[PDB]
Design an enzyme around this catalytic site. Structure first.
Site, short mmCIF file in Angstrom:
data_model
loop_
_atom_site.label_atom_id
_atom_site.label_comp_id
_atom_site.label_asym_id
_atom_site.label_seq_id
_atom_site.Cartn_x
_atom_site.Cartn_y
_atom_site.Cartn_z
N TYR A 1 -9.62 -11.73 11.84
CA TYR A 1 -8.73 -10.58 12.01
C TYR A 1 -8.18 -10.55 13.44
CZ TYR A 1 -6.72 -6.09 10.58
OH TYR A 1 -5.87 -5.07 10.26
N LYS B 1 -5.46 -2.57 15.75
CA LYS B 1 -5.96 -1.47 14.93
C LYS B 1 -6.82 -0.49 15.72
CE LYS B 1 -3.83 -2.31 11.17
NZ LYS B 1 -2.80 -1.38 10.64
N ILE C 1 0.83 -1.21 0.00
CA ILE C 1 0.00 0.00 0.00
C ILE C 1 0.86 1.27 0.00
CG2 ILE C 1 -1.67 1.37 1.32
CD1 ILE C 1 -2.97 -1.28 2.16
N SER D 1 1.18 -9.25 2.87
CA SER D 1 0.59 -9.58 4.17
C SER D 1 -0.77 -10.27 4.04
CB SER D 1 0.48 -8.33 5.04
OG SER D 1 1.76 -7.82 5.35
N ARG E 1 -4.78 -6.87 -2.17
CA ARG E 1 -3.92 -8.04 -2.35
C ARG E 1 -2.45 -7.65 -2.20
NH1 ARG E 1 -1.85 -12.54 -5.51
NH2 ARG E 1 -0.80 -11.07 -6.92
N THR E 2 -1.96 -7.73 -0.97
CA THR E 2 -0.56 -7.45 -0.68
C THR E 2 0.14 -8.71 -0.16
OG1 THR E 2 -1.08 -6.70 1.58
CG2 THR E 2 -1.05 -5.03 -0.17
N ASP F 1 13.84 -0.90 12.40
CA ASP F 1 12.96 -1.88 13.02
C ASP F 1 12.27 -1.19 14.19
OD1 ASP F 1 11.79 -4.02 14.54
OD2 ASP F 1 13.21 -5.42 13.65
N1 LIG Z 1 -3.58 -5.38 2.58
C1 LIG Z 1 -4.76 -5.04 3.09
O1 LIG Z 1 -5.79 -5.61 2.74
C2 LIG Z 1 -4.86 -3.93 4.10
C3 LIG Z 1 -6.10 -3.33 4.30
C4 LIG Z 1 -6.21 -2.30 5.23
C5 LIG Z 1 -5.07 -1.90 5.93
N2 LIG Z 1 -3.89 -2.50 5.73
C6 LIG Z 1 -2.77 -1.98 6.52
O2 LIG Z 1 -1.87 -1.27 5.64
C7 LIG Z 1 -0.53 -1.37 6.13
C8 LIG Z 1 0.43 -1.82 5.03
O3 LIG Z 1 0.46 -3.23 4.86
P1 LIG Z 1 0.43 -3.92 3.40
O4 LIG Z 1 -0.93 -4.54 3.25
O5 LIG Z 1 0.93 -3.00 2.33
O6 LIG Z 1 1.44 -5.15 3.61
P2 LIG Z 1 3.03 -5.14 3.37
O7 LIG Z 1 3.34 -4.68 1.97
O8 LIG Z 1 3.50 -6.51 3.82
O9 LIG Z 1 3.59 -4.03 4.40
C9 LIG Z 1 3.93 -4.37 5.74
C10 LIG Z 1 5.21 -3.63 6.11
O10 LIG Z 1 5.39 -3.59 7.53
C11 LIG Z 1 6.78 -3.70 7.78
N3 LIG Z 1 7.12 -4.21 9.13
C12 LIG Z 1 6.61 -5.31 9.73
N4 LIG Z 1 7.16 -5.48 10.95
C13 LIG Z 1 8.04 -4.48 11.15
C14 LIG Z 1 8.97 -4.06 12.23
N5 LIG Z 1 9.07 -4.77 13.38
N6 LIG Z 1 9.72 -2.95 12.02
C15 LIG Z 1 9.63 -2.23 10.88
N7 LIG Z 1 8.81 -2.55 9.86
C16 LIG Z 1 8.01 -3.65 9.94
C17 LIG Z 1 7.32 -4.64 6.72
O11 LIG Z 1 8.69 -4.36 6.48
P3 LIG Z 1 9.76 -5.51 6.10
O12 LIG Z 1 9.18 -6.21 4.88
O13 LIG Z 1 11.01 -4.71 5.82
O14 LIG Z 1 9.84 -6.38 7.33
C18 LIG Z 1 6.45 -4.31 5.52
O15 LIG Z 1 7.14 -3.39 4.67
C19 LIG Z 1 -0.57 -2.30 7.32
O16 LIG Z 1 -0.55 -1.49 8.50
C20 LIG Z 1 -1.91 -3.01 7.22
O17 LIG Z 1 -2.41 -3.29 8.52
C21 LIG Z 1 -3.75 -3.50 4.83
C1 LIG Z 2 -11.73 -9.76 6.25
O1 LIG Z 2 -10.52 -10.21 6.87
C2 LIG Z 2 -9.35 -9.61 6.48
C3 LIG Z 2 -9.29 -8.51 5.64
C4 LIG Z 2 -8.05 -7.99 5.28
C5 LIG Z 2 -6.88 -8.55 5.76
C6 LIG Z 2 -5.54 -7.99 5.35
N1 LIG Z 2 -4.85 -7.30 6.44
C7 LIG Z 2 -5.11 -6.04 6.91
N2 LIG Z 2 -4.26 -5.64 7.83
C8 LIG Z 2 -3.38 -6.70 7.98
C9 LIG Z 2 -2.26 -6.84 8.80
C10 LIG Z 2 -1.51 -8.02 8.77
C11 LIG Z 2 -1.91 -9.08 7.93
C12 LIG Z 2 -3.03 -8.93 7.11
C13 LIG Z 2 -3.74 -7.75 7.14
C14 LIG Z 2 -1.16 -10.39 7.91
C15 LIG Z 2 0.25 -10.27 8.46
C16 LIG Z 2 0.25 -9.53 9.78
C17 LIG Z 2 -0.26 -8.11 9.61
C18 LIG Z 2 -6.97 -9.65 6.60
C19 LIG Z 2 -8.19 -10.19 6.99
C20 LIG Z 2 -8.24 -11.35 7.95
#
Ligand SMILES: NC(=O)c1ccc[n+]([C@@H]2O[C@H](COP(=O)([O-])OP(=O)(O)OC[C@H]3O[C@@H](n4cnc5c(N)ncnc54)[C@H](OP(=O)(O)O)[C@@H]3O)[C@@H](O)[C@H]2O)c1
Ligand SMILES: COc1ccc(Cn2cnc3cc4c(cc32)CCCC4)cc1C
Ligand SMILES: NC(=O)c1ccc[n+]([C@@H]2O[C@H](COP(=O)([O-])OP(=O)(O)OC[C@H]3O[C@@H](n4cnc5c(N)ncnc54)[C@H](OP(=O)(O)O)[C@@H]3O)[C@@H](O)[C@H]2O)c1
Ligand SMILES: COc1ccc(Cn2cnc3cc4c(cc32)CCCC4)cc1C
Lengths: 255, 254
Positions: B155, B162, B18, B195, B192-193, B64
């Site tokens: 979740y 959160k 993201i 994580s 779709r990331t 970190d």
């Molecule tokens: N994907 C979704 O559907 C979704 C939806 C809503 C919100 N979010 C939120 O958006 C944010 C971005 O996540 P993403 O979905 O883009 O996944 P992502 O690309 O895997 O991003 C997660 C990042 O967090 C970093 N991280 C994890 N542990 C750490 C630590 N101890 N110290 C420093 N950095 C750390 C990772 O860095 P390294 O790889 O260098 O370890 C990685 O770059 C998250 O906060 C997530 O909760 C995601």
């Molecule tokens: C409807 O349920 C969901 C909807 C979106 C997600 C994606 N997602 C959002 N914030 C996240 C943080 C983390 C993970 C997945 C995450 C995995 C690694 C740790 C941090 C997950 C569920 C379960």
């Protein structure tokens, strides 16, 4: 980022301190073609002077009283044939009788209740319906609300119920108009000294409280609402609908 | 505008992050960008990913968030190399996958505290240190998910983290307001990331959004970037302590 070749209808400028005028100044600097609606003849006089704008055809002034179906239907039909189809609408219209804000809520008459509902909430529904006809590719509709719709605020009374209704109206319009690619959002503006703040006693006291308790420790102005309005009326807010944005120095977030 | 603005972007793992959507947008707006990473593997990705217009930039710092020393030292180096900063995009989250698979009542102490530590407290120390580089003010933005407001299946412990992060945003807003620093959250819809690719049945929920959400579609990374651009700029002038949903209107339904 667009706005250059885009067209917006602004509803509810009364004078130079109107929230909607703040919106107009911002969208004008970004180069938008603007269309204005007004109720009172006095507001028409003010509109013409306030066209201290960069807008080329300082026309696009339409008389629309949202209590009349006729006027909103005819009004928007006239906009389409004069200007073409539009890209968004800014809604900045509310009314309640002053006696209902002085003023014991349990004493509110039916007619006083329905009047506020009619002009402050239902107006969005009908304006959205007519506005849709001129947005074949989609667009963005923004309404102005206040914190009184979420919490019981002293003296706000019947307008608070009208605002709560309006906020839910936004959500139900967002769900309905979404498939047409029309986004509907609200701005919850902090208190501002406008024509509508006239008659409201102890208005300085509430601005004093914002200055002293809000995270930013300052009041907001019309142009700040205008900048968020620009965000909501454009494709910068592409994935955002059914939302209520507080432009209030963070006051919504505190105790 | 943004030509003379500098932002720190935390949490880029790869092309689908993201936070890369955020960078993409800010870079188009002419901003100078500073990136932080934890894994060496993420730093290698950053160097490839810099298909930006940040010319001999590569402002890359290993931070970190679990380490107090790494975050304090990290921002001191940023401050040294770039001078002053205008904002931070926080896009870091973590939890052990066992806690999502996974009965919430079975969550261990280590799991609970680790998710809080990385996903929530990380914003607090970053804000404290980033403040040192914002003499005239700035904007901090964190990414959250609807799971913080409502109980979402699987979740679990991340939802609690959160909810902790959302309150963190509000308390930092009240704290940093007088220093002219705004702090807000973006509540992103499912994307779709890397994580999300760890959660089973992720396709099911993307299908759900597509059918139920007002806009009848999913959002992408650049859409979160555009709202971030709004929140990081003076366009969101009087907005602080807010949570803006970029989720096709899913927050507003049933
Ligand atoms: N994907 C979704 O559907 C979704 C939806 C809503 C919100 N979010 C939120 O958006 C944010 C971005 O996540 P993403 O979905 O883009 O996944 P992502 O690309 O895997 O991003 C997660 C990042 O967090 C970093 N991280 C994890 N542990 C750490 C630590 N101890 N110290 C420093 N950095 C750390 C990772 O860095 P390294 O790889 O260098 O370890 C990685 O770059 C998250 O906060 C997530 O909760 C995601
Ligand atoms: C409807 O349920 C969901 C909807 C979106 C997600 C994606 N997602 C959002 N914030 C996240 C943080 C983390 C993970 C997945 C995450 C995995 C690694 C740790 C941090 C997950 C569920 C379960
Ligand atoms: N001022 C604040 O502190 C504050 C704070 C939060 C939210 N708001 C909201 O912001 C919006 C704008 O108000 P404002 O503060 O800028 O004061 P304002 O300039 O008086 O705006 C009110 C406008 O509504 C119009 N209106 C009233 N009844 C109408 C009808 N039947 N048909 C068509 N138009 C009608 C008025 O036009 P005429 O005068 O020509 O009738 C006037 O232009 C309102 O919805 C208000 O609830 C205000
Ligand atoms: C202390 O509570 C308040 C805080 C802000 C306000 C200002 N305000 C916000 N929306 C309004 C709508 C109307 C009026 C005043 C309004 C006037 C009549 C037309 C509709 C009013 C009160 C009462």
């Amino acid at each position: 980022l667009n706005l250059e070749n885009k067209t917006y209808v602004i509803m509810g400028i009364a004078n130079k301190r109107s929230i909607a005028f703040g919106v107009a100044k911002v969208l004008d600097q970004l180069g938008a073609k603007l269309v204005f609606t007004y109720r009172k003849e006095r507001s028409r006089k003010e509109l013409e002077k306030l066209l201290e704008q960069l807008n080329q055809p300082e026309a696009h002034l339409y008389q629309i009283d949202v209590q009349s179906d006729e006027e909103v239907i005819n009004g928007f039909e006239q906009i389409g044939k004069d200007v073409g189809n539009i890209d968004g609408v800014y809604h900045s219209i509310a009314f309640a009788n002053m006696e209902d804000l002085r003023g014991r809520f349990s004493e509110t008459s039916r007619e006083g209740f329905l009047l506020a509902q009619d002009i402050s909430s239902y107006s969005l529904t009908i304006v959205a319906h007519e506005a849709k006809k001129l947005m074949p590719e989609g667009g963005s509709i923004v309404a102005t609300t206040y914190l009184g719709g979420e919490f019981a605020v002293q003296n706000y009374n019947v307008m608070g119920v009208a605002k709560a209704s309006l906020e839910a109206n936004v959500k139900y319009l967002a769900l309905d108009l979404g498939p047409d690619n029309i986004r509907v959002n609200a701005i919850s503006a902090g208190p501002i000294r406008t024509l509508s703040a006239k008659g409201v006693g102890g208005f300085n006291t509430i601005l004093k409280e914002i200055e002293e308790r809000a995270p930013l420790k300052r009041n907001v102005d019309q142009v700040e609402v205008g900048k968020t309005a620009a965000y909501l009326l454009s494709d910068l807010s592409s994935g955002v609908t059914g939302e209520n944005i507080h432009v209030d120095s963070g006051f919504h977030a505190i105790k």
